A paper describes a structure:
Voltage-gated Na+ channels (NaVs) rapidly activate upon membrane depolarization to allow passage of Na+ ions into cells.
The NaV1.4 CTerm contains the 5-helix globular EFL (αI–αV, residues Glu1614–Met1706; residues 1599–1613 not observed) followed by a long helix (αVI, residues Leu1722–Lys1748). The apo C-lobe contacts appear to be anchored by two NaV residues which are in the C-lobe’s hydrophobic pocket: Ile1734 (120 Å2 BSA) and Tyr1738 (119 Å2 BSA). The CaM C-lobe also forms four Glu–Arg salt-bridges with helix αVI: Glu114–Arg1736, Glu120–Arg1739, Glu123–Arg1745, and Glu127–Arg1745. As expected, in the absence of Ca2+ the CaM N-lobe is in a closed conformation. Its surface contacts the CTerm in such a way that CaM helices A and B of the N-lobe contact helices αIII and αVI of the CTerm burying 495 Å2.
Numbering used by the authors:
A (entry chain B): 3 to 147
B (entry chain A): 1612 to 1706, 1714 to 1748
The structure:
Amino acid sequence: QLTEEQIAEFKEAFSLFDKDGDGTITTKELGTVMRSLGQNPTEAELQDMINEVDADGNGTIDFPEFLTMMARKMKDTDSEEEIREAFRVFDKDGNGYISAAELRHVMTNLGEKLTDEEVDEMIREADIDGDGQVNYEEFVQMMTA
Amino acid sequence: LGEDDFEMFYETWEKFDPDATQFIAYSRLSDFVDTLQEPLRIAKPNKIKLITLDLPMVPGDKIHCLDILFALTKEVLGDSGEMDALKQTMEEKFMSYEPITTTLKRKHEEVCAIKIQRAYRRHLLQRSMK
Ligand SMILES: [Cl-]
Ligand SMILES: [Cl-]
Ligand SMILES: [Cl-]
Ligand SMILES: [Cl-]
């Protein structure tokens, strides 16, 4: 299910960190490859991934194994906590609020950009008080219900 | 690496920043660094490379000419005294810059944005069936 663009990114990231041109990265390098891709898994999450499929204990991973590991992790859709955490990167105060205008910018400037129609409805549904502020913890609870 | 490469750098830079604003859109950077000649060039595919370079970005998602130069320069030379000396030297010769993010943080921001976008789209799809 991985997109072609994702594969190109994975190939570039992996190759970028394959120090030896050996076709394999080290399990320790895995977290850095993942950060180069925008993913910030915790040490525990990283260990879980490193532990699985490095049965031999050699300490390396090749590109087929990375794709398989990558495909598994990303296919399962995000929990509510993950979504909440996603909002927090954009919350300058860590207070659970982002301005509607800032939310609109992020939504249309990055990623799988929302259309005009989509972002307008997002703001209608998120700025429930019409005060230019979004309490995103409430909005994520609504959106995932 | 000598005057030839730097002279080439700004000749290429002018094509991308004709009004001499000293900034280039992040979205054009991959093309910019691919267009340079070696060794400063970073050939395509270079999107993840540029992320790893952790370049400062200013409002409107723009990156300053010197931050790019220094990064490309350090890429070839390394973290050395000459590199440090050259940078300070070059900055003086070259001579409002306010960073709100970096190319590295921005890739994580993209990933987080996508989680939100996909959740919202799922929400819209669920609403329309119920
Ligand atoms: Cl070998
Ligand atoms: Cl959920
Ligand atoms: Cl412009
Ligand atoms: Cl590229």
